[PDB]
Amino acid sequence: EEFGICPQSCRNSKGSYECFCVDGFKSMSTHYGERCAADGSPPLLLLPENVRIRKYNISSEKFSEYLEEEEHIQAIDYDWDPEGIGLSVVYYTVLSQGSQFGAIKRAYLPDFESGSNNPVREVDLGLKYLMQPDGLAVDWVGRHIYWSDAKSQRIEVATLDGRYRKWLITTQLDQPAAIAVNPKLGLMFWTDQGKQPKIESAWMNGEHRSVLASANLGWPNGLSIDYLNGDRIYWSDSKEDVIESIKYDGTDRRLIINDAMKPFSLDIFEDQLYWVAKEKGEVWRQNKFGKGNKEKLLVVNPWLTQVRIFHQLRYNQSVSNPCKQVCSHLCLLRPGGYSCACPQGSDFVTGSTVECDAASELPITMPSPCRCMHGGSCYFDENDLPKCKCSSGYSGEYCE
Amino acid sequence: DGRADCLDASDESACPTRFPNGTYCPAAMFECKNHVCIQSFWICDGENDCVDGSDEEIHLCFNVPCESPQRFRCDNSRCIYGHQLCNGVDDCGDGSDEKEEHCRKPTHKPCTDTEYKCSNGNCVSQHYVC
Amino acid sequence: RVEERLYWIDAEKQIIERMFLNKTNQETIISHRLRRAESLAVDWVSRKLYWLDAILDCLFVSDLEGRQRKMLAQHCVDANNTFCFENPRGIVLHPQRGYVYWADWGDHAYIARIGMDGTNKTVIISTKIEWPNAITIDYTNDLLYWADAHLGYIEFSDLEGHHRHTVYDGTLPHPFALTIFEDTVFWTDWNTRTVEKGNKYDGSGRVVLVNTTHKPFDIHVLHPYRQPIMSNPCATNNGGCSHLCLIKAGGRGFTCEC
Amino acid sequence: ILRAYVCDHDNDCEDNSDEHNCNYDTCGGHQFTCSNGQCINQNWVCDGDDDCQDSGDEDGCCYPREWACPGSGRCISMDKVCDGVPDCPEGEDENNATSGRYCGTGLCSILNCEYQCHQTPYGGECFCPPGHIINSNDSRTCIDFDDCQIWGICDQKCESRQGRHQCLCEEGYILERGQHCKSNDSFSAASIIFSNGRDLLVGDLHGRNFRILAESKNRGIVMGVDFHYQKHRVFWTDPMQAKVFSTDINGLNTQEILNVSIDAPENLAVDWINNKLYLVETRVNRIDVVNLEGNQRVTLITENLGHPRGIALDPTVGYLFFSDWGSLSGQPKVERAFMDGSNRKDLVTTKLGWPAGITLDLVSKRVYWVDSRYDYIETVTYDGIQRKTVARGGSLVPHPFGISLFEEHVFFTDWTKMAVMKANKFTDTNPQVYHQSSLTPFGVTVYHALRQPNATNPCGNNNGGCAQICVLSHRTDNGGLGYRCKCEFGFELDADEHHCVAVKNFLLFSSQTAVRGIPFTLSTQEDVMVPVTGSPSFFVGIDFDAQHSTIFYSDLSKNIIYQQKIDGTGKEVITANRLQNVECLSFDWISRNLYWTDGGSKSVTVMKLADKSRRQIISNLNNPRSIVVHPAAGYMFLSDWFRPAKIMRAWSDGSHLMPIVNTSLGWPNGLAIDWSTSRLYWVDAFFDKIEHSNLDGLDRKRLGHVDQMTHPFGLTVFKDNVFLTDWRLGAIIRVRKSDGGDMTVVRRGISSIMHVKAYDADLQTGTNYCSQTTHPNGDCSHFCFPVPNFQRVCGCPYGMKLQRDQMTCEGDPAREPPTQQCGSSSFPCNNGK
Amino acid sequence: HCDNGRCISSSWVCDGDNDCGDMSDEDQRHHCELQNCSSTEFTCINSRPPNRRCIPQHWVCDGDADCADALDELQNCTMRACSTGEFSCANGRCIRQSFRCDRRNDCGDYSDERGCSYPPCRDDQFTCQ
Numbered sequence A: 001e002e003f004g005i006c007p008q009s010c011r012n013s014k015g016s017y018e019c020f021c022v023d024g025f026k027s028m029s030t031h032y033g034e035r036c037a038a039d040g041s042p043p044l045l046l047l048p049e050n051v052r053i054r055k056y057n058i059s060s061e062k063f064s065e066y067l068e069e070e071e072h073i074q075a076i077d078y079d080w081d082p083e084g085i086g087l088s089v090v091y092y093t094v095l096s097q098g099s100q101f102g103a104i105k106r107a108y109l110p111d112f113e114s115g116s117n118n119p120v121r122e123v124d125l126g127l128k129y130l131m132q133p134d135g136l137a138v139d140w141v142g143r144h145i146y147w148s149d150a151k152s153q154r155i156e157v158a159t160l161d162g163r164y165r166k167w168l169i170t171t172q173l174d175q176p177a178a179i180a181v182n183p184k185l186g187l188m189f190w191t192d193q194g195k196q197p198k199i200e201s202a203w204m205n206g207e208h209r210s211v212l213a214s215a216n217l218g219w220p221n222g223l224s225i226d227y228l229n230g231d232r233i234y235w236s237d238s239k240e241d242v243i244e245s246i247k248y249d250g251t252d253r254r255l256i257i258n259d260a261m262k263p264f265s266l267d268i269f270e271d272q273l274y275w276v277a278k279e280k281g282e283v284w285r286q287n288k289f290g291k292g293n294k295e296k297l298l299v300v301n302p303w304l305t306q307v308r309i310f311h312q313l314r315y316n317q318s319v320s321n322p323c324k325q326v327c328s329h330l331c332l333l334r335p336g337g338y339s340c341a342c343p344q345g346s347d348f349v350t351g352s353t354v355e356c357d358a359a360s361e362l363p364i365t366m367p368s369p370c371r372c373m374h375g376g377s378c379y380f381d382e383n384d385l386p387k388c389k390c391s392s393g394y395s396g397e398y399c400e
Numbered sequence B: 001d002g003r004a005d006c007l008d009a010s011d012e013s014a015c016p017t018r019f020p021n022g023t024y025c026p027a028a029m030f031e032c033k034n035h036v037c038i039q040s041f042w043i044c045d046g047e048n049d050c051v052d053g054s055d056e057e058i059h060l061c062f063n064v065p066c067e068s069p070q071r072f073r074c075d076n077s078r079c080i081y082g083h084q085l086c087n088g089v090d091d092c093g094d095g096s097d098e099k100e101e102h103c104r105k106p107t108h109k110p111c112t113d114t115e116y117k118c119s120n121g122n123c124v125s126q127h128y129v130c
Numbered sequence C: 001r002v003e004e005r006l007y008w009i010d011a012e013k014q015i016i017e018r019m020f021l022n023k024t025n026q027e028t029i030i031s032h033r034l035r036r037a038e039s040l041a042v043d044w045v046s047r048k049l050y051w052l053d054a055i056l057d058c059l060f061v062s063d064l065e066g067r068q069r070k071m072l073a074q075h076c077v078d079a080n081n082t083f084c085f086e087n088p089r090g091i092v093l094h095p096q097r098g099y100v101y102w103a104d105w106g107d108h109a110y111i112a113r114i115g116m117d118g119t120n121k122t123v124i125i126s127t128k129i130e131w132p133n134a135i136t137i138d139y140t141n142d143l144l145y146w147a148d149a150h151l152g153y154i155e156f157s158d159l160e161g162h163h164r165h166t167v168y169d170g171t172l173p174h175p176f177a178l179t180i181f182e183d184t185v186f187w188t189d190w191n192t193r194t195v196e197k198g199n200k201y202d203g204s205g206r207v208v209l210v211n212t213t214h215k216p217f218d219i220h221v222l223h224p225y226r227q228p229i230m231s232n233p234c235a236t237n238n239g240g241c242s243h244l245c246l247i248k249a250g251g252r253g254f255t256c257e258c
Numbered sequence D: 001i002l003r004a005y006v007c008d009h010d011n012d013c014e015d016n017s018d019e020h021n022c023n024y025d026t027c028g029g030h031q032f033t034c035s036n037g038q039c040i041n042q043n044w045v046c047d048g049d050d051d052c053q054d055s056g057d058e059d060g061c062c063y064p065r066e067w068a069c070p071g072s073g074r075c076i077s078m079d080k081v082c083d084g085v086p087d088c089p090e091g092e093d094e095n096n097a098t099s100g101r102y103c104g105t106g107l108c109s110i111l112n113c114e115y116q117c118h119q120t121p122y123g124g125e126c127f128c129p130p131g132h133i134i135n136s137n138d139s140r141t142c143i144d145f146d147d148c149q150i151w152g153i154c155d156q157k158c159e160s161r162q163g164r165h166q167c168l169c170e171e172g173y174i175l176e177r178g179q180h181c182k183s184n185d186s187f188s189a190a191s192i193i194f195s196n197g198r199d200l201l202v203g204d205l206h207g208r209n210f211r212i213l214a215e216s217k218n219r220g221i222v223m224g225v226d227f228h229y230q231k232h233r234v235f236w237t238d239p240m241q242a243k244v245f246s247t248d249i250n251g252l253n254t255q256e257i258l259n260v261s262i263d264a265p266e267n268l269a270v271d272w273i274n275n276k277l278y279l280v281e282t283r284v285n286r287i288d289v290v291n292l293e294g295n296q297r298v299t300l301i302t303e304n305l306g307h308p309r310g311i312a313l314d315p316t317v318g319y320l321f322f323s324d325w326g327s328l329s330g331q332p333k334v335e336r337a338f339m340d341g342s343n344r345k346d347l348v349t350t351k352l353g354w355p356a357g358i359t360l361d362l363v364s365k366r367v368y369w370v371d372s373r374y375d376y377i378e379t380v381t382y383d384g385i386q387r388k389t390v391a392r393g394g395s396l397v398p399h400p401f402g403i404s405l406f407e408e409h410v411f412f413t414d415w416t417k418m419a420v421m422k423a424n425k426f427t428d429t430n431p432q433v434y435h436q437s438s439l440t441p442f443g444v445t446v447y448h449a450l451r452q453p454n455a456t457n458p459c460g461n462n463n464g465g466c467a468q469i470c471v472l473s474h475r476t477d478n479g480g481l482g483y484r485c486k487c488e489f490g491f492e493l494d495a496d497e498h499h500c501v502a503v504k505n506f507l508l509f510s511s512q513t514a515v516r517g518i519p520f521t522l523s524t525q526e527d528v529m530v531p532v533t534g535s536p537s538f539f540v541g542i543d544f545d546a547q548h549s550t551i552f553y554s555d556l557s558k559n560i561i562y563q564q565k566i567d568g569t570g571k572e573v574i575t576a577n578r579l580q581n582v583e584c585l586s587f588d589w590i591s592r593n594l595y596w597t598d599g600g601s602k603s604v605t606v607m608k609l610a611d612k613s614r615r616q617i618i619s620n621l622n623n624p625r626s627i628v629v630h631p632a633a634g635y636m637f638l639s640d641w642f643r644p645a646k647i648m649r650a651w652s653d654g655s656h657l658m659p660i661v662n663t664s665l666g667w668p669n670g671l672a673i674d675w676s677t678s679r680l681y682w683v684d685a686f687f688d689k690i691e692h693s694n695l696d697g698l699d700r701k702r703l704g705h706v707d708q709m710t711h712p713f714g715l716t717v718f719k720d721n722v723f724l725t726d727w728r729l730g731a732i733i734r735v736r737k738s739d740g741g742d743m744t745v746v747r748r749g750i751s752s753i754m755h756v757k758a759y760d761a762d763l764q765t766g767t768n769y770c771s772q773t774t775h776p777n778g779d780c781s782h783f784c785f786p787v788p789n790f791q792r793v794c795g796c797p798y799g800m801k802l803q804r805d806q807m808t809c810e811g812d813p814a815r816e817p818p819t820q821q822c823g824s825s826s827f828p829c830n831n832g833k
Numbered sequence E: 001h002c003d004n005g006r007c008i009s010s011s012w013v014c015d016g017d018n019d020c021g022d023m024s025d026e027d028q029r030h031h032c033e034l035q036n037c038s039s040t041e042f043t044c045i046n047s048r049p050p051n052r053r054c055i056p057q058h059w060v061c062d063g064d065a066d067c068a069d070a071l072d073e074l075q076n077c078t079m080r081a082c083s084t085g086e087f088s089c090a091n092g093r094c095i096r097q098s099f100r101c102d103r104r105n106d107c108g109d110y111s112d113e114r115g116c117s118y119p120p121c122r123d124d125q126f127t128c129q
Ligand SMILES: *[C@@H]1O[C@H](CO)[C@@H](O)[C@H](O)[C@H]1NC(C)=O
Pocket: A041, A042, A044, A057, A058, A059, A060, A061, A111, A112, A113, A114
């Protein structure tokens, strides 16, 4: 029942306790389960600057360049290896510039070691009239994208290909800024940076809404969830200068890091918290329970808006999708199950609550990406199809 | 765009008339001499949100209201957020924030009926007394 | 009506709780020294709560926060020791007249009235009464209504018991508590487990609104007119009472008690 | 023409036949009367509209460089204010006014104008240069104005980049004279295609070269014309022959007739993105979708449609526009819908008269429609929010019928002028003529590449995943183009909305214009059974045979009884003689017999279909309105409306007749049998009630009043449900037969729905003596009739004689009964009087 | 929504109570028999609708018959307490002892009159059919 007691799972005993890691994790701390390590390739960091996205590798203390853009990249979220081809997908938002509306973009991120040798193209979900999409969240169970827009004051859900668009919350919103989703619980959490800042949680289908924090909030600008230690919620404040954690039901609230140098984004991995300093362009990490002292990893370009952690086990892919193909347009998770929803400007066919009266839309398959592994090189054929050429010592298709 | 994309704000530094009002930004917003705009809330709160510091020229601080439990006001007539009051940082340069008068430990409640008194300045429920 | 609150008794927990009609706040008001609470009444003018106990066999008065507590009646009500607190299961209040009414289903069943300050202890109904579990008042007629689970009737009389009429006469199997609004009377029945409505004078119209798996225990109507607006005697200075102020029998003036 | 318009003191007819012989009467109430003897609604007297052609209905109660010349809103360019032709209601915009006014500039000397000053008959006027307006605060100086707001500022797009306006044309056009938009030279020269009756003609945009696209003197009137540009095909419809034809723009001896057996097609629209044709049928109140070959057919809109006359399509957004009269209200309206028919909206519902003809503008996203009653051409935006008038009045547009749009001009056909006309799509105070002849032009369309812009067809790949048919639709969220799936006749969509499941049993009902089969549940499939229609027509009685996939229906317009197959592959006539008023039909599937009732002859008749043998079995009835037959039980049930109304039971041959129910019945109507419960159900249309009893009428129960069964007419029973139709709601309702209150409406808006039946082979079961293989046909000669206790009787045709075995009948069937159409007290005559 | 034009909490549907007043929430269209009670619930073996199939586990042993068969009370838990001045009935009820044997059913399941031997009326009394 103690907060700091264990990083992932705890078991009681007549005169003691045991800490244990969940599946996919291993324990190698001096004390069993006091710290956990994650299988697979080492974690990576994703660093969206003003007009470019950069990658960092914690295991090698190495830097790589991934994406360049002509507009201010605001929020980043990713989907891990949705096709099993070894390339994750990244989703990012760009704000409106002058008369040009904002947009949400889709790109491929290789899970293997790669950099500029594999140029990455961009796809646009086609979500029209976006103005200031300050927040982005990905749902890997339901295969949905969730985003928050501060000028329209809305939270909207769509299919990862932008194929169906629904509005979940429109009323009583003041500058929605950050959004996070938990598909296991079927809950979504977001922050409001309005005149009266707030932290709210709702059902991933919008049918239930609650406010978890409405006091001592200056500018909740970042939101992260911890699924390995319960389902805790963590948010960063760059005006209160604090990182705070609550239970997803609001029954518990704690202050984890004090004198956080203007924290603007949060991520949690292997018992450590990672956050960014608004103006310093710095990345700082500490222990997620507030223990010890804080350390500085990178001194990145001052434009760093967010830090994200990229790893197979950050999001539990194993989580089962309950939609079972019953709904015809949209299926949205809720605690203990699912619900059906129609695109905006539509309603259910008379008498039904599982069918919608709206045009059907074809899945938008993303173009073939550059897949040259082992430090190979990628070149486009005359028909624009991608092809690979490999460096000394590597051969076969792509660079397998 | 109203957002400093140059650290020196030289991008917005030469913006033309953005609105026929002669102003550079709309309502429910604050404007700075560098032609950069910021949420009015950030005015006079111990952070140069405008890189040129124009968002908190000390003369501006007197106007913003600050409720005592959620926000704090410093002797410099500048306002600071509640958590900052004893975070260990001089969030306001006068160093009123972090003053021992404010930070010192609480005054324990006087022992009520059904309770007991201890030399320790502590109160114990009567049943626990022995 | 004033606080927009609901008050109820829980016999498994032996507690009295109050909530807001918007369901946003719930509190426990009396949490100890309740042996067998059986009936609860609330007073909207004096800001008081009244309840009956069937183990202590007494009547209690308190302030809606559950802090002040006084015992207002005990033992017998007839100076003959035939009618005495044995199984009190009914309570209704009339502030305009300064009276409290309660019903008891002891082997000697009776309906008795006492004054909100504990004075003028008297018996109103004593004949052809066997199992009262229901007492209610109609303020648009100054009428008193009660139901008998044994004799199967719903009867109405005047506030002093000298006129008697039957809406239903022996036709109800096991009637329980009653409530009245406009030209309609509503009652609960334990053998059929129903909530039914009828015409308060002759029952010429009868329908069943709900039936239930569990026995229905209490039924009331909520509307401002069920708690009419009137001048509180203790309104300005609490009557100068140091602890409790209670409307005198007859509804004029107040009394102060420790 | 609608009867109400006849003798209304206004010419609706092409040749004025609706007013020539009329004797008029006064008008009043919430109305107004004006010059030329016309009556107008009260609100119209002050709304800025010239509803009276004298322009009198606005006298008492405008952009830069424009003036509101009368004392009200008639707004005209500054030159017209004195040009010398009365552009306003009674002059007041002329050199001198008969009302006493004269053109001058005296006030200008006082005004001290900031810019040009102009002469006005009344006083004087001041105006400002482009990009500016005069200000109401002083009527003398100039203020800065958003020129783009001006209707007609540019042909396609306008931008006030620096207050000063600039004009832009879409990617398919080029810009001329700073406001005009012309079509890129890359495309072929634009062409006009129009019909004048027997022939279809092609002409050039300037009206000096004409040719005939198909000169074969072998077809009816060409009514509607539409084209496909990429396929270089032209399509037109002929209602005289009930056919649709397609030709190649070259006219080089290639003419095709589509495989679409549709009754009375009258208007045609083409979809070039999905290769689909959309057809409009006015007498049948139907809109249908087919492919360019006619081989795949879907019914898109049949409910709450009335005489659809004009249709237009935009497949780049998935929009369909049509004009129709509400079946439940009879009011003219213009509607927008999704090309799948799924979503409908009303764009114009006020001041619409007779809205025949619709065309679309694809760069400005506008709808243009024609009204022949109020003599106007008017345009709205796809959302209906903004309305403008291009031309109005009998002088400019007296009787327009067809409309098409290209660039800055609209082309329409007028029957009074008997001409094809050219006008400016923004405002034309003096339309122009493009073709003139002594023949009435019917349809006009314009043929150019930019009239059919390209878009990615969502259906084009893998048929959009639809198992049978794919139709375009509108994306309600993105605003773009999407798709939907449709199933052929005899099929219904599966829960996945992509695969089609075959429908074996369906619900069958009859109406004035059509006989239709629909699923027993709420469904998007408008028709399962191939519809049945005719004209002029009124279908009342319907029964089915499920063993041979046949339906039987009667028509009171022609007084004929027909048998048809649910797949449309067969149509035959059972009888067309001596039928006076066939009110109800019933069929016996064991003996292959058909029974019908006639209120004219007050008799019940039975016929055998294996050899077409006929007999009349009950006569001297009063109002025999409903009949049902039970072969396995050997019983026949019949209802009579004559007071006291009654329900009667008989043996299949009529040898017994007894009133099984004769109390508390006002209009005993449709009768149904429940084979599971051996029960009889009936509906009463006067008392609007549903009652059911056993075959003896000895046990009688009444269902709880259906929440909206205001006036029911027909009843059928299927499984745990009862299905009834309502004659006022125009609906089909579903109810639960044990209590009467599980309530659902399966269809609504069906005009003149009459009877409902349930089609199922499972229902048409059982056996009787006639069926036995040991006694084929019950060993009868000409008729076999089931009677109780598995017995049978052998009947004979009319006029024949029976013999000793009492099973064989021999004699002469050659004589039909006389023509006794007249009732008692009337002498019949040779002249049918 | 009910045929009466009444609105009721959805959980109430197929629960054995005439919550709609017209039984609209407890009829064949709902298919109460097909319902598959939750693990947190309890089941009644002889479930014929409208007799409710599902009972909350908390209710099973409470002293009150929840299933039509009273199976929930026909289980292991004991009979509730009653006063010495009272009589007890299979309904899980305690009634004043004087009520015993007066030909009027006070307990509901007639346990208040079952097995009674009645003394004849006195001379001061009158007798009723
Ligand atoms: C990160 O660095 C380690 C070496 O420290 C290497 O094994 C791993 O493949 C790298 N991951 C990526 C994605 O480059």
